[PDB]
Amino acid sequence: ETLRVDPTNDRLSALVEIYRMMRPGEPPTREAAESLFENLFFSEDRYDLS
Amino acid sequence: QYRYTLPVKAGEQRLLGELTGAACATLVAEIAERHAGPVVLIAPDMQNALRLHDEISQFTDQMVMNLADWETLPYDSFSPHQDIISSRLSTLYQLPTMQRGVLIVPVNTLMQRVCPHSFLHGHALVMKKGQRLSRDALRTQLDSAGYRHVDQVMEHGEYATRGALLDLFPMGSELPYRLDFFDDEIDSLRVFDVDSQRTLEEVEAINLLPAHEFPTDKAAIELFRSQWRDTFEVKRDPEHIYQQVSKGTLPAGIEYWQPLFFSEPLPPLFSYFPANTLLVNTGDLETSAERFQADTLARFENRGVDPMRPLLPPQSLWLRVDELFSELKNWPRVQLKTEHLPTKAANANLGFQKLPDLAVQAQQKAPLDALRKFLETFDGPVVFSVESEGRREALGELLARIKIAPQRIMRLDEASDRGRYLMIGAAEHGFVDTVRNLALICESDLLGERVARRRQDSRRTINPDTLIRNLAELHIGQPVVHLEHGVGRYAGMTTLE
């Protein structure tokens, strides 16, 4: 049901949706969005469980 | 007499070689001066094209212009500052018919698709002395064209209407015009300055070109919405350009929505070339066009996201390089190469070789040593081609140091059997023409090399009885001097990271 209510169909538009939720304004690009998501949870320096 | 043969056929080539900088200018100058037919020089990059826009003037009086590029990248986010557009489409009006003259286009605007003659021819018009054309009727015609009504007309696309007196600035011409409509008819075509505000003189007929490179009226907006709802999707948002042009206002990066406004594929502007037209090539198109298309595709896939303002496929707005190199084969081509091409027909290597290094330096007692040796041992004409007249004084005293006073000639053909000649232009690298033994010695040929050096090795006298010969047998603790820091105690070997 969440897939049905989801207005997104692939990975790249998903990253763009995450960008537009993260940062109002700033019309997203490809590298900006993928970099934001890749350092949002998968960078040893900007995200760290002890 | 000439040195090579003009080509006129479908797609044949003519290869001219051994050329070096600031000689492509004089070759294409003689091309313009010898050939009946417009010459469209297609530079490998706009930067180079700008440079050429100087040098050709320096070597010819024949009419020259560029085609103005939008100053943004492919799929960028800026309107081109419509002033530029005012130049651009103006050339597209005359490009249907121009018998002589040269137009310099880089590969970027060479491969862009342009608005068809249907739009530009249809939305252009003429105003003569004797039309019975009504005042507000002409105002509404300007409205349907898509100009802007202001009372302080200074720049392009601006018009005013005050009772009987009407003025406007056509996007094709360069000066505004005043109308003075009486009994619902044109009575005066008076050119008045943007600064004087007074009539300079009176013409009988003049032409008007529309707003900018795509229509704007409501039928066109409905067509735009139809084609958007065909190809892309819509989302209700006041920044989404679909609804944002449904509010009527044109966004910033709207010029990259060219084909939607037009209901037909856009011509690749080769239709805009006259039938008997010759192209000359510089560098190698096969690399620069391909690099531009790769950059366009990379920037597209980078920006082919953000569904708020999605984007087109480049295979409609821009040409593909295979299509470009097929459509080139309907125009004869002359390739200017800076390389020695070996031998074949339709291929002549013109001796345009490098000048020897006339470097001027005051370190030697005689500054103009190489110059005074080269010019005297030379046997043909030499021309100096100073940039500015004030810089000509920079010629006059320096050539006075070996007491040389040159002649001032306009055209390069005014060179004689042997002598010293000066002229005005912007060429930057001289050469020697072996066929007529001409010498060109530009401004930067005497001030060639930039130098950066300060000092080194002050106290490096490494044989003093105190250098210790770097023997490395010193016991630990014996004091040691380091030249940059000072005196201390040596404390042995160590290992670090």
UniProtKB/Swiss-Prot annotation, chain A:
It comes from the Bacteria. Belongs to the RNA polymerase beta chain family. DNA-dependent RNA polymerase catalyzes the transcription of DNA into RNA using the four ribonucleoside triphosphates as substrates. The RNAP catalytic core consists of 2 alpha, 1 beta, 1 beta' and 1 omega subunit. When a sigma factor is associated with the core the holoenzyme is formed, which can initiate transcription. This is DNA-directed RNA polymerase subunit beta. It comes from Escherichia coli O157:H7. The gene is rpoB.
